Symmetry: C3
Subunit: 411 residues, 3 copies
């Protein structure tokens, strides 16, 4: 196979060629040839992604809840975690704002199979509240049911950490063995992400060739319209949040950005906040942060606290709905806020990861990826995921450095 | 929240206030206001309990079967385990006796939603026997099917212990890693039990306010009628079993009770045979039992061998049926005997645990907690669980000391 | 119970007595008495086997893929693994050949319940390809779906091994903890195999008494006709493959066989290539193989590389079909080739294991053991499994020694 090229370059080549191939075949009237021959490769790609969506959600949120659990956090831990959560929550809400004053997805509205998407009637508020508690965690796990899985995973993670405080040796031993296995399943799933992302240049080529062969050319305008809303959201997160909090804590944001420049560009290109952590930490040393602090806050923020991913997942969910034609209600919007923060946490810091955890948001909000309309819109975003994931990652790391500088400024 | 008060006092306050609130609102004709506003908090409480019911059953019975497995038991182990099982089996059968000459539950008979509970026809005896063997353990686990889960868990635990006898290092390593993870999941679930039991004072308040707003006042008489049957069963277990076997083995039961007085009262109040083990062992030393013996039999009996819990689960199952209106057939009664002994084993020694493992008996006998009638009767017992759990725990510990004294007298 | 006799002797006694009992009861017209009283014991036996089929498939193939993964194999590893795979692939294809020029199963054709087996129409090739990727590993695991489980298990195993290459300590730690738990579940399941195989003498007695009470006597001829096709396949694997490759690498096959004589007979009688490994290794030393080499290749081939099992599973699958009356299409036949190699890998080296992993092949090919016709033919082979398993095991070990000798000759 000798497929050696830098994945990001391969993905962008597949994306450009797919768009061209799709348009010339679609114009000349071969959208069916694309549908039958090209698309199944994109179909395989998305199947491999929604394959990992359930194990990742459970395992990553057990681990995520564990590394946040009150039983684990010192005074510096609580500080950095409160920052991480607030920044992420503000990021997704700002994504809502961007994805609302922009209307990405609108105009694409299609009914694959002639049947337009219809949201099923929401149960009473008491019901949907109680329903987040599963009656059989195994069952909720074994058949979708994302929200119960969220609930059980977060509970399990916290419970494990309190067991790790126990006086008894064997209790800690046992609790750590379970956590040490769940974590490691999560890590295994994200290796599979790396593997599937090696196939991504082909999948993306097919996904965009299909999406170009039909839906004409407006998709190019609408996909760029998403990218716009996301990136201006990212820059707003940098300016309106980082720059502001940095100035509030007596840190010149301009010199701060010049220091972070290396870690920010590394993240932007590598598209992995975990593979940028050595540069991120070297930067934090370069700007005079105390070893004891940033050697703990930065590796925690390498996986938790992805403000870009949260904002991305927020905007992307609005595109899915706007495409489908449904109007995301209030409540559904605050559902996004909560679940995208939780999805931002579960996301690994691997290139593809953010789009996989996006499904967790879609599923909770009521846009199931089994529905053909959802899956078509979901595929529509995977086409240009790498474009978003570059800026996405950069902001994920910038948030780490900012909070680390602020908390060190205090502690 | 600053909720600091002793849980048992909070539960009893919630129980008394709920009863009052329910009655005055029910009398004045506001049972619907209670149904719509108060009850959902009780509904949340029971949902959190039946959430844990499946993981606890699997994990605790893997661990329980492991600590009983013949591959693990020395000569002293076999002795104390044979005692533990016989005493537990006699306890539940005595519970049957008490719950039969008392008729608790009768007179409450209600059909929530109008339709009265109907037991589905039992398959042929060959079928129900074969059916305890699952064809897909994962499947049986993923959708109720308690009895298959019992079967697979018990088998898995025993198999692990034989792997732990193997000559090969890595075999033991792997087998211990799996057991060390299953145990630890069980421990995590029982932390969640502790957590949910912190909400219990509210849940119990709602459960009893609802049960008072409807069903008039007779519930008070019938709940007390259960408490009566349980406690006289507990005292009969002490007198007819412990006192008798103690005298058979040349141990004066009166001086025995005076020695155990501390451990017996500690259990009664703390409601945790595991949190009473330090007192239980200190007592066993006070009464001249050899270190090597009671340092092994007592911590084993701290989790296995809960004669009170078995008896409680036996009586409580009869209340559920008598309420529902069904007549527990012979066979169903010996099913109770077997499954309540197994449920007594799986129970942790945490306050709430016994009522959670009660569901395992109800489910096996054919009273599924999904059915509205079952769930209403099940909630009816949770209201006054702490009352039963006090004596329940005390007898669980008294059995430990009695057997430890008897086996030391021999070995 | 004091059931002490050598299992193989007990199984052969049960098999002979069952055949006699069945025939005299069937001739005298008591096939119904056998159906209602005898058969349920055989039914229990097969239920215990298809119980283990799902956990074993997942866990063994996670472990199997791990011990084959490129991230683990040195230059000697790659050599011995390439040998192991090619030999196993050739073995099953040779089984196909034997089970095709022999027609075992034909003439037995029955429709238990008056309804003859009908294969459900195959989806398009694109569909069945995509379908091997599950959308919820938990779901595929929780309800049959063998092929998705194959896919997820093999992926998970490989991913774990790459995590075990990571620079980070905790990553390797976590990945090894998960693997150390999955392995160990697999080991526990195979202890259950040992346990169930202690009941086998009764189960086999009932299975063959039922199969004799009905289906007259032709079954004896047809069962022997399978045994013939299998054993002549095994001898062909030895002569046409081992002897040939041994001569190609300058090793006199006759002196080789005389050296291996001990390990070959031990396997044949013990029916456990893992319990024969000490003899297998002692033989490899006796014939001048370098310590460093055979101490790694032989224990790997003790579990992976079962040429006899692959060949057995191939032939047996043809019997199941021929009985049922369906014609195994091309494609279905190469499916057998792939899945029987994979089943040969997952098989443990315990007596019973090969027939359990046969179900994995049957399930993938489209012969579900839930269907009554399949289950009847599947039971028809379990009757005489021990006969096949003796030669089966011997060839599994001979392949280990042959490859070890060949690779040592080179490396
Ligand atoms: N690529 C992002 C994570 C994601 O959204 O997939 C990061 O490394 O931070
Ligand atoms: N509380 C009991 C167990 C139970 O029945 O919940 C004990 O500690 O023994
Ligand atoms: N008994 C075989 C494995 C099997 O086919 O069950 C062996 O030991 O190699
Ligand atoms: Hg697209
Ligand atoms: Hg009540
Ligand atoms: Hg047979
Ligand atoms: Na994350
Ligand atoms: Na980050
Ligand atoms: Na106890
Ligand atoms: Na217990
Ligand atoms: Na072998
Ligand atoms: Na094998």
């Amino acid at each position: 196979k000798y497929i050696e090229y830098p994945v990001l370059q391969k993905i962008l080549i597949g994306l450009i060629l797919g768009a061209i191939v799709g348009l010339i075949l679609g114009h000349y009237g071969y959208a069916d040839a694309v549908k039958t021959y090209v698309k199944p490769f994109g179909d395989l790609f998305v199947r491999l992604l929604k394959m990992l969506v359930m194990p990742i959600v459970f395992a990553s949120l057990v681990v995520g809840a564990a590394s946040i659990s009150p039983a684990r956090l010192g005074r510096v831990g609580v500080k950095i975690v409160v920052y991480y959560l607030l920044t992420s929550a503000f990021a997704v809400t700002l994504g809502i704002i961007m994805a609302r004053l922009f209307n990405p997805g609108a105009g694409i509205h299609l009914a694959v199979g002639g049947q337009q998407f219809q949201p099923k009637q929401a149960p009473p508020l008491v019901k949907i509240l109680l329903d987040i508690v599963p009656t059989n965690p195994f069952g909720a796990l074994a058949n979708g049911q994302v929200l119960p899985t969220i609930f059980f995973a977060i509970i399990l993670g916290i419970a494990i950490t309190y067991l790790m405080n126990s006086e008894n040796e064997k209790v800690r031993k046992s609790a750590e063995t379970l956590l040490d296995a769940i974590n490691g399943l999560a890590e295994a799933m994200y290796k599979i992400v790396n593997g599937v992302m090696q196939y991504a240049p082909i999948g993306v080529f097919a996904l965009i060739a299909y999406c170009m062969a039909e839906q004409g050319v407006k998709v190019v305008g609408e996909l760029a319209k998403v990218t716009a809303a996301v990136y201006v959201g990212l820059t707003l997160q940098i300016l309106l949040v980082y720059f502001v909090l940095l100035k509030i804590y007596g840190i010149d944001p301009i010199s701060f950005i010049k220091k972070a420049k290396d870690a920010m560009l590394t993240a932007f290109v590598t598209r992995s906040s975990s593979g940028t952590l050595p540069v991120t930490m070297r930067v934090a040393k370069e700007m005079g942060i105390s070893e004891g602090i940033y050697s703990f806050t930065l590796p925690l923020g390498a996986t938790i606290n992805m403000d870009g991913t949260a904002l991305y997942q927020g905007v992307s969910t609005f595109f899915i709905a706007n495409a489908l034609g449904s109007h995301l209600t209030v409540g559904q919007q605050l559902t996004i806020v909560l679940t995208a923060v939780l999805a931002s946490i579960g996301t690994a810091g691997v290139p593809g990861a953010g789009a996989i955890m996006l499904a967790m948001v879609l599923e909770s909000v009521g846009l199931p990826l089994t529905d053909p309309n959802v899956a078509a819109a979901y595929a529509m975003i995977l086409c240009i995921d790498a474009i978003l994931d570059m800026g996405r990652t950069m902001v994920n790391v910038t948030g780490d450095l900012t909070g680390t500088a602020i908390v060190a400024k205090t502690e």
